[PDB]
Design a protein around this ligand. Structure first.
Ligand SMILES: CC[C@@H](C)[C@H](NC(=O)OC)C(=O)N[C@@H](Cc1ccccc1)[C@@H](O)C[C@H](Cc1ccccc1)NC(=O)O[C@H]1CO[C@H]2OCC[C@H]21
Lengths: 99, 99
């Protein structure tokens, strides 16, 4: 679809069999989700933002469905204030900015 | 134009007579620019992101040109690592996400 930006671009995602709400964020290199129990192995990682850096759990090759589009890639899990879908997954679903 | 998301979506902007590079960010409510001396009154504000909050100066009704498209709104100035164009100005140039 085409999504305007009057409101936050929030969409439903499905991950690890669970539904969640997440922000499509062209300003994020990576996808970061709030604390949650994801299956599989994970590695500690740090990611930085406008306020500073946080500690996260990096999960690899995780399946996510974003408004009916499937993506398989890296998902970071940690104390983020909002679930954000970053460019690593936005590119897999064919997302572009247009104006 | 159409902007892909393989790399950070950086574009040239013109503000206060100066040219700058900035990130088109659908995950940002507000526009935040790196420290610069803009004339006029301002109000203090705190903005949050991953990692915490930073203190910024809020300027009102500032004109910005974004790839030839003009927009007028609130611009925050402070110690951000990157110049960020947020939804308050992206809506004015008719920007959409498409997939
Ligand atoms: C000016 C921004 C604030 C106004 C705005 N918050 C807001 O609107 O709250 C109401 C805001 O922070 N939004 C971010 C998403 C977000 C996070 C928390 C709460 C709401 C929304 C995102 O859109 C922009 C940042 C910009 C950036 C890029 C590079 C280095 C430092 C900072 N990207 C980012 O943090 O990305 C992370 C995750 O992936 C990694 O790539 C880049 C860095 C890594």
């Amino acid at each position: 679809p085409q999504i305007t930006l009057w409101k936050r671009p929030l969409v439903t995602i499905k991950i690890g069999g669970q539904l969640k709400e997440a922000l499509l964020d062209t300003g994020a290199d990576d996808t970061v989700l709030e604390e949650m129990n994801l299956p599989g192995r994970w590695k500690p990682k740090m990611i930085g933002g406008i306020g500073g850096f946080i500690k996260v759990r990096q999960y690899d090759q995780i399946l996510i469905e974003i408004c009916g589009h499937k993506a398989i890639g890296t998902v970071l899990v940690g104390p983020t204030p909002v679930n954000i879908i970053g460019r690593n997954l936005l590119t897999q679903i064919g997302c572009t900015l247009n104006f």
